[PDB]
């Protein structure tokens, strides 16, 4: 019951939907095809309800990980970009929109954690995690602190744990191996040990969460934090002279944050799949189309190479893409639930001092 000859697009209200509506205006002026952009509340929860009965939008924008369950239910059509179009996007962004060897969405934007620092308290941010204890000593003598970030959630602590060899599921040729988990290896032990040592040596508080860390950095009480592009607007209001750079390395190896990819899927029940392909490939995924959305609300880093190179003149965006390329695409498989439990459990047990790092990791699996 989706109307044929027009396009209905769903995108979250936190995105530049008025900018996207301008791209739809250009598409209608050129092709005669009316495009209607909507930002319904909780669209990612409404989509599987209406798409299951042949309803819903023609196009849906959301984070790539949710599209795994959509394709599992057969709600997303397979897209058909040729070789030349795929070369215009960074190769790793296509890994985020693949389900069982099939492309099921177009990569739009790229987000990842970065190292955020106070330029006044710290003109040169550290390049390594090993420097941070000495840096905290010099800052604690001034009533300040070196680093405060959300220790309570594994999304924020995994980049350090993965740095020396930790991994979620062994990634091969677009297929995750649910049997090869890398949470209890020598790389993950060294990262958690350094994290726990930061807490035991009183450089970080084991109770610091997202809200505490954000308040301390925006009030100038700490020199660094770790967060993503979604947090920049709160710092802009704080008027703190901040910068965004690459995450510190551990044992000479980069921090490996998870990568979220805003993706555009095509409804499997849509009768306008070719129009949807034409709109996404030839109007939106261009320098002109992404700029219209970006002008409305910034996308952060984008998958389109040519426009990312322009946006990367903002050093905060360049750092975001740099950390993302040094990180890993967040897996879109249901087995991530068990992975999150293991990492969250091992950190809380080891940080409080109840268990050793080795005991904390092996007990999180059992």
């Amino acid at each position, epitope marked *: 019951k989706i109307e044929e000859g027009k396009l209905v697009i769903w995108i979250n209200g936190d995105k530049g939907y008025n900018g996207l509506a301008e791209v739809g205006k250009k598409f209608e002026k050129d092709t005669g095809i009316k495009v209607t952009v909507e930002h319904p509340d909780k669209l990612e929860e409404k989509f599987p309800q209406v798409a299951a009965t042949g309803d819903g939008p023609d196009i849906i924008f959301w984070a790539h990980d949710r599209f795994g369950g959509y394709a599992q239910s057969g709600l997303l059509a397979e897209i058909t970009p040729d070789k030349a179009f795929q070369d215009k996007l960074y190769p790793f962004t296509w890994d985020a929109v693949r389900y069982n060897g099939k492309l099921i969405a177009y990569p739009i934007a790229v987000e990842a954690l970065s190292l955020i620092y106070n330029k006044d308290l710290l003109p040169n941010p550290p390049k390594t995690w090993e420097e941070i204890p000495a840096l905290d000593k010099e800052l604690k003598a001034k009533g300040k602190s070196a680093l405060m970030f959300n220790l309570q959630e594994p999304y924020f602590t995994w980049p350090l744990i993965a740095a020396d060899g930790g991994y979620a599921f062994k990634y091969e040729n677009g297929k995750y191996d649910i049997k090869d988990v890398g949470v209890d290896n020598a790389g993950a032990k060294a990262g958690l040990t350094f994290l726990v040592d930061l807490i035991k040596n009183k450089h970080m508080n084991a109770d610091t969460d*997202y809200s505490i860390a954000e308040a301390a950095f925006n009030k100038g009480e700490t020199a660094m934090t770790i967060n993503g592009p979604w947090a920049w607007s709160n710092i802009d209001t704080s008027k703190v002279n901040y910068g965004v750079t690459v995450l510190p390395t551990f044992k000479g190896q980069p921090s490996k944050p998870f990568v*979220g990819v805003l993706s555009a899927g095509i409804n499997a029940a849509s009768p306008n799949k070719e129009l949807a392909k034409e709109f996404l490939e030839n109007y939106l995924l261009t320098d002109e189309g992404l700029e219209a959305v970006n002008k409305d609300k910034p996308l952060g880093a984008v998958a389109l190479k040519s426009y990312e190179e322009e946006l990367a003149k903002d050093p905060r965006i360049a750092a975001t893409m740099e950390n993302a390329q040094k990180g890993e695409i967040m897996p879109n498989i249901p087995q991530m639930s*068990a992975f999150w439990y293991a990492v969250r459990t091992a950190v809380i047990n080891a940080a409080s001092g109840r268990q050793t790092v080795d005991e904390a990791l092996k007990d999180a699996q059992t």
Partner: antibody
Amino acid sequence: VQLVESGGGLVQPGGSLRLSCAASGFNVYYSSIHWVRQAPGKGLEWVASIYSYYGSTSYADSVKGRFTISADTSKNTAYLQMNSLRAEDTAVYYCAREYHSYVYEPPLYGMDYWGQGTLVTVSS
Amino acid sequence: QSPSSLSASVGDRVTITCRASQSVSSAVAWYQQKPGSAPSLLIYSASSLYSGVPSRFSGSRSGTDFTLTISSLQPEDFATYYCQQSPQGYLVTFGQGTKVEIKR
């Protein structure tokens, strides 16, 4: 979109009771399901939560070690297993949904949907 | 805990301050509960009005203080109001209830 509760009733101190929260209209896997109880004439008290997508469960101090929250994704239903019950556990028990957009978010959106509540009386 | 009491008239402006939110600076939600019914969400993230709630309800944050304001009390507004915080992200605490009652 609905949250239907069942499993309440009478129970003795030291006994056990298992509450159920069957959901429809959304997938509990991608939400936090909360249990909130309210003693007669008293205010709300948070009990436990489960966020299966993020592999997390949480418990209030007053029930930690005695209650166990779980979920059955195939049945779209959450459970509260209450053990070692005491008279102070007597209350109307609600289940509620807390919405989440992204994996990085802290709690933001509160509890938009609530069950009808079921009365649990712990007494000899 | 037994809920606090506040007596007001139709048309009055009422401002409720969350007492449990003095713990931390996290997001604050407000709820309305009538006798014999489940609470209903009014406001989330301190100031975002939940879909469908009348615009006379508003929430604000000024530093560590979170308030809920009813600009002009309507007859259907006399009920009990709760604020909800998340001190450590995993923990959840509801404040003491504030029951708005009818002046006569």
